[PDB]
Amino acid sequence: QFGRDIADTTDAVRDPQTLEILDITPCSFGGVSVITPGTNTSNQVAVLYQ
Amino acid sequence: VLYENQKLIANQFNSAIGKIQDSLSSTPSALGKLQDVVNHNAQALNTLV
Numbered sequence: 001q002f003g004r005d006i007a008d009t010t011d012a013v014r015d016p017q018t019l020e021i022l023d024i025t026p027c028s029f030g031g032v033s034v035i036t037p038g039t040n041t042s043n044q045v046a047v048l049y050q
Numbered sequence: 051v052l053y054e055n056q057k058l059i060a061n062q063f064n065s066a067i068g069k070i071q072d073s074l075s076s077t078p079s080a081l082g083k084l085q086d087v088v089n090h091n092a093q094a095l096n097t098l099v
Contacts, residue, residue: 006096007096007099008099009099
């Protein structure tokens with residue numbers, strides 16, 4: 001009915017309606033860091049997605 | 051004792067370079083530290099998984 005990997009997580013599932021096989025991949029995730037200079041100089045910032 | 055047998059010591063150095071290039075990957079246990087530090091973190095991360 002389904003399958004796992006070395007991570008012991010369900011990364012492959014089979015829908016019981018049809019005979020196809022559907023992969024399982026998580027959507028976008030990760031931390032965020034803000035690039036900025038010293039606050040005494042300027043307030044301009046940059047956004048970095050990890 | 052270098053300018054008098056420069057050709058001999060040059061040939062010896064080239065032979066040493068060739069034999070260390072041949073024996074760098076002669077055994078799988080030569081690069082033990084890099085493989086160990088790869089495994090000790092990869093297996094720990096996977097065990098945390």
